[PDB]
Amino acid sequence: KDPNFVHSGHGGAVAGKKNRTWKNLKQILASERALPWQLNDPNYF
DNA sequence: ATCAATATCCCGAGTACATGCACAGGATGTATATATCTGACACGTGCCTGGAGACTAGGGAGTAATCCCCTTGGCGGTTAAAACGCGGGGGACAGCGCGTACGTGCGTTTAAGCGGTGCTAGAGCTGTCTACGACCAATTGAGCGGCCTCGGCACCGG
Numbered sequence: 001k002d003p004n005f006v007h008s009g010h011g012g013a014v015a016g017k018k019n020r021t022w023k024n025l026k027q028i029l030a031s032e033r034a035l036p037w038q039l040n041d042p043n044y045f
Numbered sequence: 046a047t048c049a050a051t052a053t054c055c056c057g058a059g060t061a062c063a064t065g066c067a068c069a070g071g072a073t074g075t076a077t078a079t080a081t082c083t084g085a086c087a088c089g090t091g092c093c094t095g096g097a098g099a100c101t102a103g104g105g106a107g108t109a110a111t112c113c114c115c116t117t118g119g120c121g122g123t124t125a126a127a128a129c130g131c132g133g134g135g136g137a138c139a140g141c142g143c144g145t146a147c148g149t150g151c152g153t154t155t156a157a158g159c160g161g162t163g164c165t166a167g168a169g170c171t172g173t174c175t176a177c178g179a180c181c182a183a184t185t186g187a188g189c190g191g192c193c194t195c196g197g198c199a200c201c202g203g
Contacts, residue, residue: 018152019153020151
């Protein structure tokens with residue numbers, strides 16, 4: 001009745017006390033900024 | 046130096062809502078054991094508070110003259126009090142509903158720990174240099190003086 005019954009978490013807050021859904025968008029962009037983007041490389045910034 | 050007219054207190058009776066006690070229970074006070082650092086105790090230290098001396102003089106203690114504010118007494122005008130009647134709004138009972146407190150679930154946010162390092166503090170002697178003492182020349186103001194003009198009374202004229 002469902003595609004899968006063995007669905008696994010992708011970094012939720014079941015263990016810790018962080019946000020249950022996912023990281024905040026500001027945090028997502030802050031983490032993505034750490035990538036060694038090239039000088040002419042496109043990004044979300 | 047008393048008697049009427051009120052007002053108040055005392056006592057008795059019908060009455061009722063709030064005090065005081067028992068019940069079920071639940072959640073906070075208690076007993077036991079562990080970790081640990083805050084504060085008692087000792088030590089030296091050196092800042093500074095307490096004691097006395099002598100000299101200067103600003104300030105206080107004592108006296109005398111006196112004009113002024115304080116206080117008592119007296120009187121006129123009136124603003125409030127006491128009590129009457131008139132009039133309105135405070136006061137005593139039922140129906141809604143929207144606020145306030147629990148209950149439940151979530152995540153953002155401060156505490157804690159550990160290096161890192163400019164950063165506020167203290168004594169250093171630093172040097173300027175405003176600001177406290179002393180002297181001196183500006184205006185402001187009141188207490189006086191000189192002189193002139195006006196007005197009332199005594200003397201002579203008709």
